[PDB]
Design a protein around this ligand. Structure first.
Ligand SMILES: Nc1nc2c(ncn2[C@@H]2O[C@H](COP(=O)(O)OP(=O)(O)O)[C@@H](O)[C@H]2O)c(=O)[nH]1
Ligand SMILES: *S(=O)(=O)c1ccc(S(=O)(=O)Nc2cccc(Cl)n2)cc1
Ligand SMILES: [Ca+2]
Ligand SMILES: [Cl-]
Length: 168
């Protein structure tokens, strides 16, 4: 089977684990240990082809730069998550983008900008416009998700796999 290696990146509390666990187990998990990194593997039927997705849910604990870079080098695609309710998490996406680009040396690395917590519109700190503008500057797609309601959860994982399939 094709193996699509996806890495979840983003600052703390944005919903990396909640997105991963909603995709894997169809549950909204609100208390997943913030410091725990884990990998998840699932067989999925992508546009009618059975593939395996491997998701690395990062938790920011790896501080040794060579090891972090080694992990990013192994990844084939990235979900770069921020929370629409935390502007600083959106600012932080620039750092993950640069880290990925330094390692992959390919501006067309499969990569989605993911604005999570779309069910908290009344707490929005990041405008759709500014996120779309950043995605346009980077030539990536912007998708808003909710790990709580499941909105666009399958979409971000499937669309990332579609970019891996097309580009690699
Ligand atoms: N309302 C809402 N809460 C969310 C969403 N995603 C995550 N959360 C909550 O935000 C907190 C942090 O989520 P988590 O997935 O652990 O963030 P991580 O540090 O990026 O892995 C938890 O309390 C989750 O319930 C979402 O889409 N909507
Ligand atoms: S490793 O398998 O020993 C490992 C994997 C992931 C982490 S982390 O997610 O806690 N930290 C982190 C930070 C930036 C990029 C990445 Cl891939 N991971 C630790 C150890
Ligand atoms: Ca987490
Ligand atoms: Cl791991």
């Amino acid at each position: 089977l094709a193996l699509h290696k996806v890495i979840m990146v983003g600052s703390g509390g944005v919903g990396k684990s909640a997105l991963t666990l909603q995709f894997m187990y169809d549950e909204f998990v609100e208390d997943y240990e913030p410091t725990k990194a884990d990998s998840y593997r699932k067989k999925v039927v992508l546009d009618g082809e059975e593939v395996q997705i491997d998701i690395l849910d990062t938790a920011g604990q790896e501080d040794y730069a060579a090891i972090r870079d080694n992990y990013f080098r192994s990844g084939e695609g990235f979900l770069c998550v921020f929370s629409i309710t935390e502007m600083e998490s959106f600012a932080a996406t620039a750092d993950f983008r640069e880290q990925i680009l330094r390692v992959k040396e390919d501006e067309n690395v499969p990569f989605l900008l993911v604005g999570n917590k779309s069910d908290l519109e009344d707490k929005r700190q990041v405008s759709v416009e500014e996120a779309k503008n950043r995605a346009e500057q980077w030539n990536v797609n912007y998708v808003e998700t909710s790990a709580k309601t499941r909105a666009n959860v399958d979409k971000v994982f499937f669309d990332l796999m579609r970019e891996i399939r097309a580009r690699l």
